[PDB]
mmCIF file of C-alpha atoms (C1' of nucleotides) in Angstrom:
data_model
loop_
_atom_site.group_PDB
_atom_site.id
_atom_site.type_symbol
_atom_site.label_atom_id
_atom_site.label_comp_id
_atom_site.label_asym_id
_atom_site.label_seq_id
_atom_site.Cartn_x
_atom_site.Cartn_y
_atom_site.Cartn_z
ATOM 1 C CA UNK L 1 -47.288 -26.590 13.690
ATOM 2 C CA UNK L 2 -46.958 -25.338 17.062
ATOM 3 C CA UNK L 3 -47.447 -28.442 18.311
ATOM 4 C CA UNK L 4 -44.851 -29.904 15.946
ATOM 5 C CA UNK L 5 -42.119 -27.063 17.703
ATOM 6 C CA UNK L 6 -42.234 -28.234 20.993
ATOM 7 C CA UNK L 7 -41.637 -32.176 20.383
ATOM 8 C CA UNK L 8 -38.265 -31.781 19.226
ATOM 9 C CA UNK L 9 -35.298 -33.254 20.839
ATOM 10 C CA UNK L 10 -33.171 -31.864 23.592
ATOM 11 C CA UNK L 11 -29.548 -32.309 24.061
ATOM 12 C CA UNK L 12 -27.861 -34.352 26.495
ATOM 13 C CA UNK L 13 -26.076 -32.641 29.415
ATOM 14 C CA UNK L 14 -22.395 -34.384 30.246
ATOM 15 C CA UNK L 15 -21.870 -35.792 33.070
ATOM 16 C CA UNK L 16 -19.811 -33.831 35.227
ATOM 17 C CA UNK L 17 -16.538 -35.428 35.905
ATOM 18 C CA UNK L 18 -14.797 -35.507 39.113
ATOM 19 C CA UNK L 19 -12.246 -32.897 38.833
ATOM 20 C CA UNK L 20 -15.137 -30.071 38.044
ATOM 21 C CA UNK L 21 -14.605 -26.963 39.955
ATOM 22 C CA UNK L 22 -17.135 -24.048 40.763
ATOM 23 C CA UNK L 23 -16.678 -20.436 40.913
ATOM 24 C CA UNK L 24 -17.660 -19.018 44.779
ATOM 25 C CA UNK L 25 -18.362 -15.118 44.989
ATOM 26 C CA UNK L 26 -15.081 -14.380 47.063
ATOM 27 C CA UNK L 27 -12.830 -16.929 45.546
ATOM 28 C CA UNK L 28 -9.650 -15.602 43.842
ATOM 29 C CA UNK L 29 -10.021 -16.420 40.153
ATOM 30 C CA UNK L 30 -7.337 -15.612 37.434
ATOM 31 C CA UNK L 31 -8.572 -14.918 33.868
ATOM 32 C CA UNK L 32 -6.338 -15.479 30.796
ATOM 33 C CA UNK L 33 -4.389 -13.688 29.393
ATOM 34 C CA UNK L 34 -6.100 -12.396 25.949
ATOM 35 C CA UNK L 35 -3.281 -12.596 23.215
ATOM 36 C CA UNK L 36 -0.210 -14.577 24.608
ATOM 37 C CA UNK L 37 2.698 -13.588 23.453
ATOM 38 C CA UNK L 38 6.280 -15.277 23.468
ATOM 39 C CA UNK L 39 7.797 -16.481 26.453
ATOM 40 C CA UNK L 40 4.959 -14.039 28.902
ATOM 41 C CA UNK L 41 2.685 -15.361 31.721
ATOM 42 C CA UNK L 42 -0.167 -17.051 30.133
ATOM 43 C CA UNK L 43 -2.493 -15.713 33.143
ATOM 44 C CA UNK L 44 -3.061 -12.500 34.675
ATOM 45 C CA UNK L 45 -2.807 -11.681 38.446
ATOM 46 C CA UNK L 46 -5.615 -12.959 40.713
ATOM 47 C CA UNK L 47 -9.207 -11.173 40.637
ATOM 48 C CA UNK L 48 -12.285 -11.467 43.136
ATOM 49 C CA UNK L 49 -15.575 -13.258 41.441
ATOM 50 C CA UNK L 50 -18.177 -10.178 42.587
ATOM 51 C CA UNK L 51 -21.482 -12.462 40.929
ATOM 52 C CA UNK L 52 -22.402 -15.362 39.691
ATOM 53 C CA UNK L 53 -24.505 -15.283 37.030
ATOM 54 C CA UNK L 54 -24.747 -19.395 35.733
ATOM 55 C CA UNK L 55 -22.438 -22.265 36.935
ATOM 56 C CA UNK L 56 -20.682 -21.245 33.596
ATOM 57 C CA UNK L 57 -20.965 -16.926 33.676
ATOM 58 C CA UNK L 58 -19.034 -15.157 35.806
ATOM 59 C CA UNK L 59 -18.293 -11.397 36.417
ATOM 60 C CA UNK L 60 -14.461 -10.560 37.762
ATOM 61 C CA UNK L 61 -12.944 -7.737 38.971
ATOM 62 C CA UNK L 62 -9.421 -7.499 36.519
ATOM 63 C CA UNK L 63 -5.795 -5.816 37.686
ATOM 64 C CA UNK L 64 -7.471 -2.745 35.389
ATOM 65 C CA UNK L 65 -10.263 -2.366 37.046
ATOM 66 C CA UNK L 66 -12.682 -4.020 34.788
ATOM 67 C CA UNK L 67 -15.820 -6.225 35.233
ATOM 68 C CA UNK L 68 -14.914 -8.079 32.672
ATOM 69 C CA UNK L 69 -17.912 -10.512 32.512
ATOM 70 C CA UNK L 70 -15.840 -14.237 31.376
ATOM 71 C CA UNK L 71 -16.616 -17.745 30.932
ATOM 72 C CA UNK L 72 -15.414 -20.529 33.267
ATOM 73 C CA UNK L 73 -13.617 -22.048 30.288
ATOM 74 C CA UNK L 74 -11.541 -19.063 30.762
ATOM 75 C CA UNK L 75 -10.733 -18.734 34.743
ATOM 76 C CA UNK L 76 -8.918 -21.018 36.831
ATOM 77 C CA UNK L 77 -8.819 -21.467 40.679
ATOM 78 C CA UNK L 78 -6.216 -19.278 42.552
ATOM 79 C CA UNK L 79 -3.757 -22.135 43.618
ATOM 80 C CA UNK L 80 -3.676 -22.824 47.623
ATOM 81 C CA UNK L 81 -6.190 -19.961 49.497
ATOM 82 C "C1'" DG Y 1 -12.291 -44.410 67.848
ATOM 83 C "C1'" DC Y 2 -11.670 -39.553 66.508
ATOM 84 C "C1'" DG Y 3 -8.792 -36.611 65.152
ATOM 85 C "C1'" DA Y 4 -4.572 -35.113 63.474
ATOM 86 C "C1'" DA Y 5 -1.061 -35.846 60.619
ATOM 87 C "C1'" DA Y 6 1.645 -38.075 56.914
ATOM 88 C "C1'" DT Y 7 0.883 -40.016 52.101
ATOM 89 C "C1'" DT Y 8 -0.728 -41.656 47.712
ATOM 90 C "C1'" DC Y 9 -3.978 -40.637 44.087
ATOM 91 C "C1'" DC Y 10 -5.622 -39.100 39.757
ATOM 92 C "C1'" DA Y 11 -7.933 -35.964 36.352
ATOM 93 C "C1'" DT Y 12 -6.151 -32.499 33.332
ATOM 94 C "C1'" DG Y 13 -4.049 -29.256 30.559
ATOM 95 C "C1'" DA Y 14 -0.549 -27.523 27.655
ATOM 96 C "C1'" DC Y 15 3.323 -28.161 24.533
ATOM 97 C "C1'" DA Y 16 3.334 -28.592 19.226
ATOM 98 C "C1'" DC Y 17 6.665 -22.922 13.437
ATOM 99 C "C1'" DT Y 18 4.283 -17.779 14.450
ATOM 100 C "C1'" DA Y 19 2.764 -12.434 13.277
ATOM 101 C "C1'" DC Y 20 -0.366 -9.781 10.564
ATOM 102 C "C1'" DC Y 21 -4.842 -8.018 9.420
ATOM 103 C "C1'" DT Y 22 -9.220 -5.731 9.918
ATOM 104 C "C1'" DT Y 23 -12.211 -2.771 12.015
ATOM 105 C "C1'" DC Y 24 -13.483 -0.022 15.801
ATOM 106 C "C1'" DC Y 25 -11.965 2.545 20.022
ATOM 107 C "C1'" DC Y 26 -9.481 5.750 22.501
ATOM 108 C "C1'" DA Y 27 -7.204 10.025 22.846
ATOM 109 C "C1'" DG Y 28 -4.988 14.057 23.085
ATOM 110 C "C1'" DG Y 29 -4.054 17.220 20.807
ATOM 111 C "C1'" DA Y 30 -3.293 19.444 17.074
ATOM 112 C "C1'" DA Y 31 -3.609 20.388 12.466
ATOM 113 C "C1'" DA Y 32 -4.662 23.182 9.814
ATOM 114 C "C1'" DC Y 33 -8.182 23.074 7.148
ATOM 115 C "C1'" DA Y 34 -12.328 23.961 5.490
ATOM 116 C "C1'" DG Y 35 -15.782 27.513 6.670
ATOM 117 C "C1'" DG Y 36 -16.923 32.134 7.256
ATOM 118 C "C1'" DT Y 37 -16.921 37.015 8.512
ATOM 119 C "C1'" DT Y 38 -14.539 41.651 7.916
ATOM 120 C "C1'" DT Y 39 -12.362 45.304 5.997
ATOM 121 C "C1'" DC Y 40 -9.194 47.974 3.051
ATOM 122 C "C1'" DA Y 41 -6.532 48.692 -0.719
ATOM 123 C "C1'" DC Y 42 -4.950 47.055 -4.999
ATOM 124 C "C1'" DC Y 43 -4.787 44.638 -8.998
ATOM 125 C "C1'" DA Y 44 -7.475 43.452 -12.808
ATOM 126 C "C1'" DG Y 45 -10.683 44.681 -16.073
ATOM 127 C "C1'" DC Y 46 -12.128 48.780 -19.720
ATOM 128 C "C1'" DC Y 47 -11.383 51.330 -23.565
ATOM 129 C "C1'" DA Y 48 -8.869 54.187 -27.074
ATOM 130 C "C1'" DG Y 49 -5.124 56.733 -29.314
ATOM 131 C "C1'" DG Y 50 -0.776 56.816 -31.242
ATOM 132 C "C1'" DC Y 51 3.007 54.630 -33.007
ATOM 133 C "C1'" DC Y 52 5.808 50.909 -34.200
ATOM 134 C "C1'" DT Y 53 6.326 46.504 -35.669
ATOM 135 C "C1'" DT Y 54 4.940 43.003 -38.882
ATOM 136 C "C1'" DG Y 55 3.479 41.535 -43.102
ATOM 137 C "C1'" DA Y 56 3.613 41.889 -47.868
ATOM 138 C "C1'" DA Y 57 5.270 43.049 -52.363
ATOM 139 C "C1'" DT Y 58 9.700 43.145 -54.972
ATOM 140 C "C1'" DG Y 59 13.839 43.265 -57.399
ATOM 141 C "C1'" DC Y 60 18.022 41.378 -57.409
ATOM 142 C "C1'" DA Y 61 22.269 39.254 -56.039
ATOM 143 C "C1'" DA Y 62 24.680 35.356 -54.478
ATOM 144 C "C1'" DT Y 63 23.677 31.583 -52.584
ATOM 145 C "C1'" DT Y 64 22.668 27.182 -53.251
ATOM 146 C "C1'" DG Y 65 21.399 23.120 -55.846
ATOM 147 C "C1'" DT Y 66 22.441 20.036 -59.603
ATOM 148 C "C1'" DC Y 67 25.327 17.883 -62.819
ATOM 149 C "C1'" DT Y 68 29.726 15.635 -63.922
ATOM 150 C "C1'" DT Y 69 34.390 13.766 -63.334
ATOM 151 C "C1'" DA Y 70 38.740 12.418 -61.207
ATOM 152 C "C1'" DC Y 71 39.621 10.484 -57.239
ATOM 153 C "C1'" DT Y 72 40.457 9.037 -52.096
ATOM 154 C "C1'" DA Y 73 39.338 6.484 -48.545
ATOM 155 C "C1'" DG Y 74 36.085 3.365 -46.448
ATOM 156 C "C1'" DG Y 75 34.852 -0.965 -45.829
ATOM 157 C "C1'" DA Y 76 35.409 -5.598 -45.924
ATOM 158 C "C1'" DA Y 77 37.867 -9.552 -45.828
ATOM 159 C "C1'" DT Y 78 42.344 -11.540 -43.909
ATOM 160 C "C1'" DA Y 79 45.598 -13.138 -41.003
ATOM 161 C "C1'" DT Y 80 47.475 -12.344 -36.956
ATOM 162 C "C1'" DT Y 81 48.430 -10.357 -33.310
ATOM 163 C "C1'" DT Y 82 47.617 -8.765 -29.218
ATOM 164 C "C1'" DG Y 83 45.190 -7.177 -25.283
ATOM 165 C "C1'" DG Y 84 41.546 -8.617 -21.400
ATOM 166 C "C1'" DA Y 85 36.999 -9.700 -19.198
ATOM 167 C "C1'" DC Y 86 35.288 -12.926 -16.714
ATOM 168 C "C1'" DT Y 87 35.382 -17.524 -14.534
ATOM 169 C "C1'" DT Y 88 38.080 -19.650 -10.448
ATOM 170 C "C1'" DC Y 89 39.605 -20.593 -6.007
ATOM 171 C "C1'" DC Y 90 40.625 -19.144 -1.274
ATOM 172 C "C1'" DC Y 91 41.239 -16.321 3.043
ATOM 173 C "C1'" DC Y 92 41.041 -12.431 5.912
ATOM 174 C "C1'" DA Y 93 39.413 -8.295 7.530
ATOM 175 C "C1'" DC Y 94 35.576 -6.004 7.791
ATOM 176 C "C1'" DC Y 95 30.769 -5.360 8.546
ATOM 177 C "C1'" DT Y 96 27.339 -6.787 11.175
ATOM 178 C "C1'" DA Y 97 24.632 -8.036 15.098
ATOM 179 C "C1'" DC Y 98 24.337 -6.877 20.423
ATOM 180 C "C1'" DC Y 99 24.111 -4.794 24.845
ATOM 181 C "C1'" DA Y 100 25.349 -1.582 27.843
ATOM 182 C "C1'" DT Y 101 26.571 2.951 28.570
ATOM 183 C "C1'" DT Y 102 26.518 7.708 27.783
ATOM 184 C "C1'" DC Y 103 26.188 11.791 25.165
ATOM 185 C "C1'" DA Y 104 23.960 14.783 22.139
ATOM 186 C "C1'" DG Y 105 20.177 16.555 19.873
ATOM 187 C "C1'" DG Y 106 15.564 17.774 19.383
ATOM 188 C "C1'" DT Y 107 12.037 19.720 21.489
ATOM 189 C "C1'" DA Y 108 11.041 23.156 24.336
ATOM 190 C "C1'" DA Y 109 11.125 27.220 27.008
ATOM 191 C "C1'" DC Y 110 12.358 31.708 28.442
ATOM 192 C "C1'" DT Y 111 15.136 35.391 27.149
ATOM 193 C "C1'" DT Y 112 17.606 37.852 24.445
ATOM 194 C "C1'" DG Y 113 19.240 39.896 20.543
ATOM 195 C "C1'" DA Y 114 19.509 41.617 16.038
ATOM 196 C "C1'" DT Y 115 17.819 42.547 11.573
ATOM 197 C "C1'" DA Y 116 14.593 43.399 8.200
ATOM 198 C "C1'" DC Y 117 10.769 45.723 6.929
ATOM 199 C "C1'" DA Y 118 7.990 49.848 6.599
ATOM 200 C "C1'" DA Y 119 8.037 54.672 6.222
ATOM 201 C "C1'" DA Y 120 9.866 59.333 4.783
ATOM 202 C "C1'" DC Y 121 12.778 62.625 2.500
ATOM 203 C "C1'" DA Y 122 16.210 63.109 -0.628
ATOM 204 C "C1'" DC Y 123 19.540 61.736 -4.268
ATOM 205 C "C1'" DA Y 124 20.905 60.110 -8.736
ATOM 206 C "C1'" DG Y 125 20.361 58.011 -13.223
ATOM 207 C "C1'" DC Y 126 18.186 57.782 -17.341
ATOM 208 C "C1'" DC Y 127 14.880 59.217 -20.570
ATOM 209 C "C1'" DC Y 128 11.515 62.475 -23.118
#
DNA sequence: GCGAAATTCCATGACACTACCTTCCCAGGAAACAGGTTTCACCAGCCAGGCCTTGAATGCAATTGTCTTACTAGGAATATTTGGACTTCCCCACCTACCATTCAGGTAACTTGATACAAACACAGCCC
């Protein structure tokens, strides 16, 4: 049975498309804004990435003051550093 | 030909009707409250003696309950006559929804002010 756990199959990884981006510790990232409301910015002001933790986990420094540990489904690049 | 500069490219994401709802956090403070200690004074519990009020027994008087009759008025049916509630249609003024502006009130604070309560000695009213 142990044997029988480690021949299953594995998923397939995408292939990453051409307009990927990845996080750099120093880049200016801007998180989301949580819960949107009416006719507000949909992002907050920009952060500094302290560390990288995964090309997908990444730890910012918010407006607050808060390491709020994100996703990169979340961020997006500062326009024009 | 390299580099700098001017330009075209293309992959992508967000717009689609939106707020509540739940549970935990935070928080400051405060709300008293639930908890508890402390002490003094008072109100409640105790018991009995005297008297007054209630209960009962009663006799009787008129009050009340029943019976009977002549009758008055109530009700119903009528025609009609009359008095109106609501449906109808339309327009205007009034209430509202809104923002900006400002004023007033509530909280809050520091002070002030004034009255009520607590105490003491005496007075008056009513009762035994």
């Amino acid at each position: 049975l142990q044997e029988i756990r480690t021949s299953l199959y594995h998923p397939s990884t995408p292939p990453a498309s051409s307009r990927s981006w990845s996080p750099v510790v120093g880049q200016l990232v801007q998180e989301r804004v949580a819960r949107p409301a009416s006719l507000r910015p949909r992002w907050h002001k920009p952060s500094t990435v302290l560390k990288v933790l995964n090309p997908r986990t990444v730890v910012i420094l918010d407006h607050l003051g808060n390491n709020r540990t994100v996703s990169i489904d979340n961020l997006k690049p500062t326009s024009h550093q």
